[PDB]
Amino acid sequence: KNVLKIRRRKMNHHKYRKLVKRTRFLRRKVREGRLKKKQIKFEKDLKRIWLKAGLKEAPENWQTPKIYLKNK
Amino acid sequence: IVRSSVHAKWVVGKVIGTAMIKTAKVRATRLVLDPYLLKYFNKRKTYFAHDALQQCSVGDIVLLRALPVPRSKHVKHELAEIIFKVGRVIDPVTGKPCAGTAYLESPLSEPRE
Amino acid sequence: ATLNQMHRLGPRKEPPKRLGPTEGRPQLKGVVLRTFIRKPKKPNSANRKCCRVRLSTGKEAVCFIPGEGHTLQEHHVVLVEGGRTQDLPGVKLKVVRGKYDCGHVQKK
Amino acid sequence: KQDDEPPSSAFIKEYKDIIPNIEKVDDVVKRILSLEMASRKEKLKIKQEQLMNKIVENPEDSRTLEAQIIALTVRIRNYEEHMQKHRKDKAHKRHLLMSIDRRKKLLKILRQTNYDVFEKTCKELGVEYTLPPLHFQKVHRRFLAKKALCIRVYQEVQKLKKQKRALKAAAAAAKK
RNA sequence: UACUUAAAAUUUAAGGAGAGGGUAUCAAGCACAUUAAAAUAGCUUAAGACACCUUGCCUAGCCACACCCCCACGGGACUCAGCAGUG
RNA sequence: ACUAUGCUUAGCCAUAAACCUAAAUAAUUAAUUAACAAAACUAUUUGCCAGAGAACUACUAGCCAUAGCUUAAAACUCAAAGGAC
Ligand SMILES: [K+]
Ligand SMILES: [K+]
Ligand SMILES: [K+]
Ligand SMILES: [Mg+2]
Ligand SMILES: [Mg+2]
Ligand SMILES: [Mg+2]
Ligand SMILES: [Mg+2]
Ligand SMILES: [Mg+2]
Ligand SMILES: [Mg+2]
Ligand SMILES: [Mg+2]
Ligand SMILES: [Mg+2]
Ligand SMILES: [Mg+2]
Ligand SMILES: [Mg+2]
Ligand SMILES: [Mg+2]
Ligand SMILES: [Mg+2]
Ligand SMILES: [Mg+2]
Ligand SMILES: [Mg+2]
Fold first, then answer.
1. Counting Cβ atoms within 10 Å, is residue B51 exposed (0-12), middle (13-18) or buried (19+)?
2. Which of B19, B51, B90, C50 has the fewest CB atoms within 10 Å distance of its CB?
3. Is A39 exposed, middle or buried (0-12, 13-18, 19+ CB in 10 A)?
4. Minimum-distance nucleotide, CA of B19 to C1'
5. Under an 8 A CB cutoff, do B88 and D115 touch?
6. Residue B53 contacts by C-beta under 8 Å, 6 or more apart in sequence?
7. How does it associate, per the subunit comment (chain D)?
8. Phi and psi for D127 in degrees, rounded to 5?
9. For C1-37, what is the HEC assignment?
């Protein structure tokens, strides 16, 4: 078979790689902010749980782990 | 001595768990007809059963009797009998211990032990 | 698929029928906003008479005006219907001749 | 380690029962036919035979589930010793993990067929059998952290209830 | 409706053999269990839990609603979704 | 001409036309030519597919991955695209 369908994907992937290259710095700031919102949503979801259970403060010796930050 | 309301007056199933005190979680299966294919498949249900003596082990076939009054929200049956014990089956036809499709004790013999 | 696989999935999942320019309604009433010409994609050649309208739903759409010659102007009221103009891409509505301000084509 | 390791003076399994019959054999000949001048594979044939005698009712049969389990316990401990020196051998790490899984499958069938034999084999071979969990549990940082708090929140709520019950009962006792 | 005690119609409550919409890019829910000396650490879930969205269905008919606040002590923007009629 | 790099020691990344483009298992070779390729075909079980493009994309979650990988749409456009000859 011909490679025509592969050529379409070849151009799509090439053009996408250069688009990511152009806006690489913008994408980095988008991600750090999407992860920060991802963390706040995680923290709030944990606060909802204990408040609904009837606790007025989080369980003793508990600190929500920061799981989306540059910990590794 | 009125009997239970529940439809399942007698249910057979396998003991899939025994981590609750004096209770055995049992999985029963029934055959339900697929209307499109007109073939029977297995619909399985979970039944909590009162195991008074904690004499049940995971994997054994058991017979449950519907309790007249529900003991709790989910415990509405008791353990009538253990049809097959896991690994300790006794052949109904001959009465001799078996281990799969074989006799641990020959039916010709009469050990009476 | 095997009978066990057909049983676990059942009948084919059916994508919902998304609505069109009229929002699944026989007709809509709109007020003309502008009258302009659209060019039929190649290989056709014409100066097709179209107009923008604000429909009762509140959105704005481009509507082809059929017939030889229309008197439509801004602020006029028209009854739009479905039916795409094949040569005109994006024009999914048509005006009904003989209703509200739009009138029947003057016969020659 | 394990209670039994074959001595270096022991004969190989081919001549284990033949040299005793022979009236007189030199020290050198015994040393050539001992486990000191043999490969590791020979020392493993002696380890297995010892375990079959001490566990299996009929050591003549090697096709029973109990015997097959014993054959895999020697291999599993052999693969483990290999992997203690060859830390980056990925083919033998696969052999070790696949034999462990094979034993679990055989132990499951043994439990379902002959429970009495199953209990002895696990006690003698020192193999713990854990039953397969009904439901698979996913694991990732977000889940493990939420599941830890939820367990902690519950415990705190229950601890408070116990304290309240004690205080309520204590007040009632004083009134009585 | 009968009898000084029994036949119906019509409802209510607690349930369960089986059946019962969509999205799995909703994959975990977070107390959802059992025992009954009050301890045990359990319960549901890819055989689809939980979440969210959409729709009256079961059709000799049934279900829900009755100005709004799921309810209606209370409060509010204060009543035709009875017939006809109006904006 | 010369560097990153190909090498070694640890750790990471998890992608290939990773394709022999043919899942695994047990058969059967007559009652059997869409074309081409590596003859046809039955049973069992799982996975996957449902016009083309948009799209190895957007968003979501997981990940030692931070110009990344896996997961993977819709609007919109067309009356075809595609395979073999
Ligand atoms: K033309
Ligand atoms: K209401
Ligand atoms: K190839
Ligand atoms: Mg070629
Ligand atoms: Mg392209
Ligand atoms: Mg998405
Ligand atoms: Mg009103
Ligand atoms: Mg009301
Ligand atoms: Mg009226
Ligand atoms: Mg009224
Ligand atoms: Mg160099
Ligand atoms: Mg390298
Ligand atoms: Mg790939
Ligand atoms: Mg290759
Ligand atoms: Mg790629
Ligand atoms: Mg991507
Ligand atoms: Mg992404």
1. buried
2. B19
3. middle
4. E42
5. yes
6. none
7. Component of the mitochondrial ribosome small subunit (28S) which comprises a 12S rRNA and about 30 distinct proteins. Interacts with METTL17.
8. -100, 120
9. CCHHHHHHHCCCCCCCCCCCCCCCCCEEEEEEEEEEE
Q: Which bases of chain F come closer than 7 Å to a protein CB?
A: 10-11, 17, 21, 44-50, 53-57, 59-68, 74-78, 82-84
Q: How far apart are CA B54 and CA D74, in angstroms?
A: 36
Which residues lie closer than 8 Å to D120 by C-beta, 6 or more apart? D55
Q: Go through chain C and tell me how many residues it has.
A: 108
Q: What residues does B65 pair with on adjacent strands?
A: B10, B78
Q: How far apart are CA C2 and CA D3, in angstroms?
A: 53
Give the end-to-end CA distance of chain C in Å, rounded to a whole number. 64
Let me know if D21 is exposed, middle or buried by CB neighbors in 10 A (0-12, 13-18, 19+).
Answer: exposed
Please state how this structure was obtained. Answer: cryo-EM
For every residue of chain B, DSSP letters joined together read -PPPSSS-SEEEEEEEE--STTEEEEEEEEEEE-TTT--EEEEEEEEEEE-TT----TT-EEEEEE-SS-SSSSEEEEEEEEEE-TT--B-TTT--BBSSSSBSS-SS-----
Pull the structure tokens for residue B21. Answer: 């005190």
Write the single-letter amino acid at D152. Answer: R
* Interface present between D and A (3 or more CB pairs within 8 Å): yes
Parallel, antiparallel or unpaired: strands B40-50 and B75-84: parallel
Q: Which amino acid is at B19?
A: A
| Resolution of the PDB structure in angstroms | 3.1
Q: Which DSSP state fits C61? A: E
**Any bridge partners for residue B15, and if so which?**
B26
